Point group: D2
């Protein structure tokens, strides 16, 4: 399923993002002078199951969760440098049941253990000066599709 996720807006998944689900987010730009950019996987109740805060002007990428209302739990950060590849950077999220696997364009996958027991019913994209394009292309799979040779 293909969705066009607009900045500071969101898309409702026609199907729950759950174990086996694969979400491939791709950007057609990558704005160097851009700042903090966020992607959130939302439960039906709109709790932030997976929060991805890309902070260029701070060389860090923060991963967290929190009830829509609640405060933020412990952060799980990793360096920002050498993660994305211009001009078409991307972010791939996979639901492995007990944790999320997140991959950028370079480096090893980041594994984020689930903290909130709910499937994602939507994906939000927030940014005041996004590092990416608006919208960003988003393909969501129910399962891992047959892979090409390269």
């Amino acid at each position: 399923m293909l969705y066009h996720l607009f900045v500071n807006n969101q898309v409702k998944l026609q199907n729950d993002f759950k174990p086996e689900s694969v979400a491939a987010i791709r950007s057609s730009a990558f704005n160097s002078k851009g700042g903090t950019t966020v992607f959130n996987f939302l439960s039906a109740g709109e709790n932030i199951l997976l929060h991805i805060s890309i902070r260029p002007g701070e060389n860090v990428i923060v991963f967290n969760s929190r009830l829509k209302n609640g405060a933020w739990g412990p952060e799980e950060r990793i360096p920002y440098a050498e993660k994305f590849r211009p001009p078409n950077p991307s972010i791939t999220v996979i639901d492995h049941g007990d944790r999320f696997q997140i991959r950028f364009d370079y480096g090893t996958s980041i594994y984020y253990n689930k903290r909130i027991k709910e499937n994602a019913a939507a994906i939000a994209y927030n940014a005041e000066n996004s590092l990416f394009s608006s919208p960003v292309t988003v393909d969501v799979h129910g399962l891992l599709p047959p892979l090409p040779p390269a």
Copy 2:
């Protein structure tokens, strides 16, 4: 290369659309009651090398070409019905040197013998009431990519 082509707008290709190039256009919604929807592969001088006029109201899809300052050539026509797959219909275009191959979701491909000897420097998307989404995802390749087993 990923581009986001908005309705009644266009996109400048990083490299020219030439022999071997593949363009994969994908929509995110498919509006069953949308009107005439067009896609134009434009040369540097704005010549319409390939014109794809999807006309649901006339149940036909028209292919043609014309120099910016010239007139349309004869029309290439094929039935519209049962060509697109909702909710994410697609259109693939491939430059085979002497002619373009156009594939939708179902049916046989369409071949349209080039009439202007030029490469494409951009692709336009036009519609007052479009069948597809704005924008449409467009992946441009320099050659056929590794094919998946499925």
Copy 3:
């Protein structure tokens, strides 16, 4: 559909190779010091609809056709040097209805007009000492499948 076409053998297709069909042949090796290597697409009556004779020594790649009991027709050739990429060289045959497109690893593809009005029922492979592996992997599609972003 995946097949393992062994050298000096052939594989019977579960469905006819016809317009829109895609045969992606891949080798696990490139025995550069090899010799003449051939791939043939045969119809039910056993006519050779498409003959591809790769000759490293002569430094050319011959394309031809011939009926079951007939002599070869005129040849259509191209230089062989560097048309294949090690360690996994590939050949991709696509039926465009009136002609086949033959894709190697390098250089613009080659088109061959159909001489025999039949669909192929088997793909053959012959060689005294192949330039490729035995077998070669062959994925046959009824139509071009969705293309990955790259």
Copy 4:
């Protein structure tokens, strides 16, 4: 990287199968009467990091590990039913660092937690009379490849 893995034989990997690596194993046939079929991921020391024994008879698929000069540890087994899709059944193995993800054609992924802290340098295939074709097509990736929209 493509390899043709023959039954009762193995293929020496170009690069180490390590975290991020993906191995797509595909067969051209499905021998319904076939007996126990095994695939082993081996360390340079020839220790069996991942052992996968498919037993149609006992309706089970066994996963284990052992040292070259060793006996089998406790078995992790799952039902054989609803895993393979003939005539081209597959098996995808992915190294997630602490564990291997294992996918067949049907059902949810299987996770086998690593027992031997070594990267695999080879992949073996053995059986008396295989359930799968000989050889099987194996595409090994250093990291997940770009995904087709569908």
